Amino acid sequence: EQSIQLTLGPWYSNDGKYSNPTIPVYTIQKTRSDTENMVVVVCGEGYTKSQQGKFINDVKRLWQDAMKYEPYRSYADRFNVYALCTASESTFDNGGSTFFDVIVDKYNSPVISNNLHGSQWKNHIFERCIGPEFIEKIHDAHIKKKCDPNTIPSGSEYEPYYYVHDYIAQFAMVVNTKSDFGGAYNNREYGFHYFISPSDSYRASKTFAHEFGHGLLGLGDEYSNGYLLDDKELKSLNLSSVEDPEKIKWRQLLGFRNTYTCRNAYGSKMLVSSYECIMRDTNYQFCEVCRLQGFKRMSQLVKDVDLYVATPEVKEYTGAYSKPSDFTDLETSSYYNYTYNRNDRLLSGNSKSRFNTNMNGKKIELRTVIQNISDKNARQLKFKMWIKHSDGSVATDSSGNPLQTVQTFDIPVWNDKANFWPLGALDHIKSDFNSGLKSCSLIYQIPSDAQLKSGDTVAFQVLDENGNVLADDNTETQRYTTVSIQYKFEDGSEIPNTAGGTFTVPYGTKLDLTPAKTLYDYEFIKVDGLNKPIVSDGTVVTYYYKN
Ligand SMILES: [Zn+2]
Ligand SMILES: [Zn+2]
Questions:
Q1: 214 is in an annotated binding site
Q2: Where does Zn(2+) 3 bind (predicted)?
Q3: Does residue 489 share a domain with residue 425?
């Protein structure tokens, strides 16, 4: 029913196997107007027409797993996700004609092969054919096509299609295969912004999150080798070759969580902010630098995100790893020695119970990093930290003074915002890592006469100017709950060509997004389940549309 149709002349389907394909469109998630959200378009490679059910379910699995990683997770409901059911003649594993002509080269890279059948523009198919048709017919902006993709434009072959990657935030191609591979193609100047990954490899979801991190977040391979020259130093979001801790771009994050610059391998001149990152080893999470940069990157594509507060931590303050000179050694063993010291000192998250009565007379530090997303509003955040008894009462010293301290932090504006992957950008060239960024550290001296009890813990809050709690001593370990969206007509029928996905939110979250006024051609009526604490897995938010 709902679909797009392409016209693929000899430059896109030289063997005539896909000269005029019909592509069913499935909406996996549309929580707001496309104009307000990041639009992701996923196509299948090597799925035959009878395998499109598998393709849809593969996309839902990969997408849901990607949304469990920060920083995506913080934006989970600000994506609209569409599955385009591109049908191949052959399965991928059978090796016959496929929709995207994908081959695996001698480096294990999946590549769209223009030379396979002589389709000279095959790897331009996303931004010249699929994208413009989708943006005209399906996307809420309905930008009418500007150029015939089977003709040579006057002037640039590329500029007429630049707009595609501003209305579609990411193209993904899922290959129907168990083969383990992955590749991301980011060259917007020449029209390329897609990645390819497999549906059923042993690490399929981790690979998907990684390639999406290259493609959408603009992060570099923390497995890369070589020395970054000054231009490439400024260009990289998450890599460096600057040995001096007083000069390295991410110096404000040094000592926060597992942020300790090190060589990404013995004797390497390529430096990473943490040895344990998915951008180097797909078994890990995103490091704090990648979370910050990716969160900043996505904030450019939506309008209502104005602050990043990394999850704060509390540590016994001994003076270790508290000054730049403590970070000068860049060997892997220095990274791990640092993380062991951090664990020995940690008093938050899963180490909250390490507090004890021997803590009197000691100092503790509440530490996080804050990025202002506004290029016009400076911010002032108030930090509170205190010693809490197990029953919730606030501990005191021997004079009845509560064991508590407060400090306010000024967050400067993001003056450099326009240089960091804004809408319309073709690349990231140079940005000031520290613009809008503020590492906040609140040190509390526990008095020698603290009246501590077994089971006491460190409590804390990060408050905004209205007193809203942005983060506290429960944030890091709080339970997340799964929510699933469904699209229905007034009469309870499921809307065709929808396949509502799930995502997760902190237990108790009240969802607050404004539904898109249209779904395909159907007009929105009402929604059940918004503005209501989400307190059970499988909670269903139901969007009702008028038939
Ligand atoms: Zn990679
Ligand atoms: Zn990283």
A1: yes
A2: 222, 277, 287, 290
A3: no
